[PDB]
Design a protein around this nucleic acid. Structure first.
Length: 779
RNA sequence: AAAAAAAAAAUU
C-alpha cells in the first residue's frame, strides 16, 4: 500500500514560513448523521438548502427544539445532540413538497467531511458556492471581460487533517461569471453588435446566439418568475405560436399581459421542453445573477484574467489575513453550537532550502555553472556538445511585405553570430529560403524539401502570429515526413534581442539531438550509482466530442539529460492511462538500445490527478510492472511513483520582510515543506521548485505513493530538485521536474495534431515518423 | 509559435 513516511529531511538551510492553513480542534462527542429525502429531485442544491432551512425556521419550536444545525445542501443533516426524531422519520412537509428523513478523527490522527459542512454552512448561506469555493458579486464595482462575461472574487475553502491537528485551508479564487443583464444587451455583446436596433435573423446567427445562451437560466420581465432556457425558436416572436384555450407568443403577450413587443422580429426562448410549448421573448428576459463560465475562454480573455489575479505575495497575504477574520468564524451560530475553535492567525512552519547542483558545460571553457535563486546565464559559456549545421532552410509564412530580404539577412546573421560563440556553430548561408502564405502551402514544400536536400537538418518557419499554419507545420514535420522544426513570429525575426536568440539556440540544439548541459555528477543523490530511468506523464482534457490525450517521456542518459517520447489517444473526461504498459515497453526498449544496460530503478512522476489516487496508483503501477514482466524473467525493476500537484490551494509566505524576494515578493526556489501542513501517514511533500517572478508562486506538491527504493527523505527530495534543473528550453528552474514538464508539451503538441479507419486516423495522427522518434521534438 | 512563472481547467 501507500508507503508511510521514511523520515523527515534535514539537508538544506532552514527558513521560517507561513501557510494559509489554520489548526482546528474537534470535540469529543460523536457526530450523528440524519439523512433527509426530498421529492422530486429536479432543482439545484441551493434550492434544496433554502427549502430545508426555511422549513427548520418555520417549524423549529418542537420539531427541532432550540438548535441550529448545518446541512450539506443535499441529503445530510448534522446536529450536536441526538435529534428529536421518531424511528425512520416524521412526516414533515415544508411549503414545496413532503420530506421524510431517515436516521474517530482524533484516533485516526464521513467524519472528515462532516466538519467541512459545519465550517461551510455559514458562508454557503451567504455567498454563491462553486463546488468547494465561494464568490461574492463585487459591491459597487465592475470587472467585465466582454461578451457579457465578468469575473468575481471569492475564496477556496477545504479542510485537511494535517499532521497533529485538523486544519482548514482558505485561499483566494478569481474566476469568471456572467453579467446579470437584459438578454438583448447580452445578445448585443455576444454578436459583437453595439446596437443594431439588417439582422432579422441570419439562420446561422440564430444558431450562433444559442451556441452560448442554450442551457442558461433567465428571469421574466425585469427585476417575477424563473425558467430554464433550452433553444432559440426558428420563427420570430410575431409568429412562433403555442396552443391555449393557438396564439403566437406575440399576440398572447399583446392581449393577456398587456405588453407590446418592441422587437417582434426577434426570436423566442424555449423553456422546459419542446412539448410543454413554453416560449419567452428576449425583451422580457433578464439574465439571473450568479452564472458561471463553463465555455472555454479566448486567449486574450485568459490573459486578462491572469492580470486580475497575478499579485505579489506580500500585499496578497494581507488579504488572506483579512479574509479569515472577515466572516468572523468564532461568531458563527453554526460552529459554536458544536464548539468549534480556529486560529485567526497563520500557520508558522520552518522549511529547508535544498542546494541546487552546479551544472557542467563544455566547449573550450568547460565551465561549471552555479544557479542563483533559479537562474544562470550562458554568456561566454559554450555548450557541452553543440551541433554544426551544414544545411538548413527558412520558410517565412508571413508575407513579403512584413518579412523582407534584409530582415532575414540581419536576423540570420545575428543568430549565426551568437551561435558559434555558444558552442553550436551555424556557419554557412542557408541553402534554402522561401516566403509562404496559409496553412496549405506547407506539406508539398516539405516533401520536396526532403527529397532534394540530402544532409538538410533543420527548417525554421517564420510565421506572423496565430496562424493555422502552425498546426500543419508541426503535424507535417512530425507525422508525415519526420524532420526538425523551430518556428518564430516575425515580431521576433525583426528585433534580434540576444536573450531571444540565445534561447532559440537552446531549443534548436536539443531538437537536432545535442545535449546543452549535464550535472556535475558528484553532487547527485545516491540513486545515480545505479541505472535509473525517469518518466513524466500528463493527461489533457477538452472543455466541450474531443478526446483526452496521454503522454510519456523516458530518460535516456545517466545525468539524466536526453528524453524519448511516446503518446496515446483516449476517451473524453477519462483520467487513467489505458495503455501505459506498452508505452513503458517501447521506452524501456529505447533505453536498452541507448545505454546497453537494463534499468534497475524506475522513478516515475505523474501530473493531472484530481479522489483519484485509490484507482490510478494501483492500476498504473501494474501497467508498469507488466511492461517489465512482459520482457524476460528476473526483471523486477524498482518503481517509485511520485504524483505532482500544481493545483491545490496551499501557499507559503516568508516571515521576514528582508527575505521577501523580488518585485513580486515571492518565495525562493527549492524550499521543502514536508512537515506540519502535509499528510501524516502518506509520503508526500511540498517543493517550491521555481522562482516567483510574476504574481505569487504555486508550490508543487509531490505525493510519493510508492517507493521500492527505500528512499531516504533527502535522497528523494534533493533528487526531485536536481531534476527540476534538467529543462532545456530555458536556463531556469521549473515548478515540476523536466519529465513531468515534457509529457505536458507532448500532450499539448498532440492537440495541434488533432486540430485538422476512425481509430487509425486519430491513432496515426499522433505517432511520429521514425526518424523523429529518437529526438527531443516536443521542446 | 525564444522562455520560465502567474490565472478557473407550477408554464407557454
Amino acid at each position: 500500500m501507500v508507503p508511510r513516511r521514511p523520515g523527515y529531511g534535514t539537508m538544506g538551510k532552514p527558513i521560517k514560513l507561513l501557510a494559509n492553513c489554520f489548526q482546528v480542534e474537534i470535540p469529543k462527542i460523536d457526530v450523528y448523521l440524519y439523512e433527509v429525502d426530498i421529492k422530486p429531485d429536479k432543482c439545484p442544491r441551493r434550492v434544496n438548502r433554502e427549502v430545508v432551512d426555511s422549513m427548520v425556521q418555520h417549524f423549529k419550536v418542537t420539531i427541532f427544539g432550540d438548535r441550529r444545525p448545518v446541512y450539506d445542501g443535499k441529503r445530510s443533516l448534522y446536529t450536536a445532540n441526538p435529534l428529536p426524531v421518531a424511528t425512520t422519520g416524521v412526516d414533515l412537509d415544508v411549503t414545496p413538497f413532503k420530506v421524510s428523513i431517515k436516521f474517530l478523527l482524533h484516533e485516526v490522527l464521513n467524519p472528515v467531511h462532516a466538519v467541512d459542512v459545519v465550517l461551510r454552512h455559514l458562508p454557503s448561506m451567504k455567498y454563491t458556492p462553486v463546488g468547494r469555493s465561494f464568490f461574492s458579486a463585487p459591491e459597487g464595482y465592475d470587472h467585465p471581460l466582454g461578451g457579457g462575461r465578468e469575473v468575481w472574487f471569492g475564496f477556496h475553502q477545504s479542510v485537511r487533517p494535517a499532521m497533529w491537528k485538523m486544519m482548514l485551508n482558505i485561499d483566494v479564487s478569481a474566476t469568471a461569471f456572467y453579467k446579470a443583464q437584459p438578454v438583448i444587451q447580452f445578445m448585443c455583446e455576444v454578436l459583437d453588435i453595439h446596437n443594431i436596433d439588417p439582422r432579422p435573423l441570419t439562420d446561422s446567427h440564430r444558431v450562433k446566439f444559442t451556441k452560448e445562451i442554450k442551457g442558461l437560466k433567465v428571469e421574466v420581465t425585469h427585476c417575477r418568475r424563473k425558467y430554464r432556457v433550452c433553444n432559440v425558436t426558428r420563427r420570430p416572436a410575431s409568429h412562433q405560436t403555442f396552443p391555449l384555450q393557438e396564439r403566437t407568443v406575440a399576440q398572447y403577450f399583446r392581449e393577456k399581459y398587456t405588453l407590446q413587443l418592441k422587437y417582434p422580429h426577434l426570436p423566442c426562448l424555449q423553456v422546459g421542453q419542446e412539448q410543454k410549448h413554453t416560449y419567452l421573448p428576449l425583451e422580457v428576459c433578464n439574465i439571473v445573477a450568479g452564472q458561471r463560465c463553463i465555455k472555454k475562454l479566448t486567449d486574450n480573455q485568459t490573459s486578462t484574467m491572469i492580470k486580475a489575479t497575478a499579485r505579489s505575495a506580500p500585499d496578497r497575504q494581507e488579504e488572506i489575513s483579512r479574509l479569515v477574520r472577515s466572516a468572523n468564524y468564532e461568531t458563527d451560530p453554526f460552529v459554536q453550537e458544536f464548539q468549534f475553535k480556529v486560529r485567526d492567525e497563520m500557520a508558522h512552519v520552518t522549511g529547508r532550502v535544498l542546494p541546487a547542483p552546479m551544472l557542467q558545460y563544455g566547449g573550450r571553457n568547460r565551465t561549471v555553472a552555479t544557479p542563483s535563486h533559479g537562474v544562470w546565464d550562458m554568456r561566454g559559456k559554450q555548450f557541452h556538445t553543440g551541433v554544426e549545421i551544414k544545411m538548413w532552410a527558412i520558410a517565412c509564412f508571413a508575407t513579403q511585405r512584413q518579412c523582407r530580404e534584409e530582415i532575414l539577412k540581419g536576423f540570420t546573421d545575428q543568430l549565426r553570430k551568437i551561435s558559434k560563440d555558444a558552442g553550436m556553430p551555424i556557419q554557412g548561408q542557408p541553402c534554402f529560403c522561401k516566403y509562404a502564405q496559409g496553412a496549405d502551402s506547407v506539406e508539398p514544400m516539405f516533401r520536396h524539401l526532403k527529397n532534394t536536400y540530402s544532409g538538410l537538418q533543420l527548417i525554421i518557419v517564420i510565421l506572423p502570429g496565430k496562424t493555422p499554419v502552425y498546426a500543419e507545420v508541426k503535424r507535417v514535420g512530425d507525422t508525415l515526413l519526420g524532420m526538425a522544426t523551430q518556428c518564430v513570429q516575425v515580431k521576433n525575426v525583426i528585433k534580434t534581442s540576444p536573450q531571444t536568440l540565445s534561447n532559440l539556440c537552446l531549443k534548436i540544439n536539443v531538437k537536432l539531438g545535442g545535449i546543452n548541459n549535464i550535472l556535475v555528477p558528484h553532487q547527485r543523490p545516491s540513486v545515480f550509482q545505479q541505472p535509473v530511468i525517469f518518466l513524466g506523464a500528463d493527461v489533457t482534457h477538452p472543455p466541450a466530442k474531443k478526446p483526452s490525450i496521454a503522454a510519456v517521456v523516458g530518460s535516456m542518459d545517466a545525468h539524466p539529460s536526453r528524453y524519448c517520447a511516446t503518446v496515446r489517444v483516449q476517451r473524453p473526461r477519462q483520467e487513467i492511462i489505458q495503455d501505459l504498459a506498452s508505452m513503458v515497453r517501447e521506452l524501456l526498449i529505447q533505453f536498452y538500445k541507448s545505454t546497453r544496460f537494463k534499468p534497475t530503478r524506475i522513478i516515475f512522476y505523474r501530473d493531472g490527478v484530481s479522489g483519484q489516487f485509490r484507482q490510478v496508483l494501483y492500476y498504473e503501477l501494474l501497467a508498469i510492472r507488466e511492461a517489465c514482466i512482459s520482457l524476460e524473467k528476473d526483471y523486477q525493476p524498482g518503481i517509485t511513483y511520485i504524483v505532482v500537484q500544481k493545483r491545490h490551494h496551499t501557499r507559503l509566505f516568508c516571515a521576514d520582510r528582508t527575505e521577501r524576494v523580488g518585485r513580486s515578493g515571492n518565495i525562493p526556489a527549492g524550499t521543502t515543506v514536508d512537515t506540519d501542513i502535509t499528510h501524516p501517514y502518506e509520503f508526500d511533500f511540498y517543493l517550491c521548485s521555481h522562482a516567483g517572478i510574476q504574481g505569487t508562486s504555486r508550490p508543487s506538491h509531490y505525493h510519493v505513493l510508492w517507493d521500492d527504493n527505500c528512499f531516504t527523505a533527502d535522497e528523494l527530495q534533493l533528487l526531485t530538485y536536481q531534476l527540476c534543473h534538467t529543462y532545456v528550453r530555458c536556463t531556469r528552474s521549473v515548478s515540476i521536474p523536466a519529465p513531468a514538464y515534457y509529457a505536458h508539451l507532448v500532450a499539448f503538441r498532440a492537440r495541434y495534431h488533432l486540430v485538422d479507419r476512425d481509430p487509425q486516423a486519430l491513432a496515426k495522427a499522433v505517432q511520429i515518423h521514425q526518424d523523429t522518434l529518437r529526438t527531443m521534438y516536443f521542446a
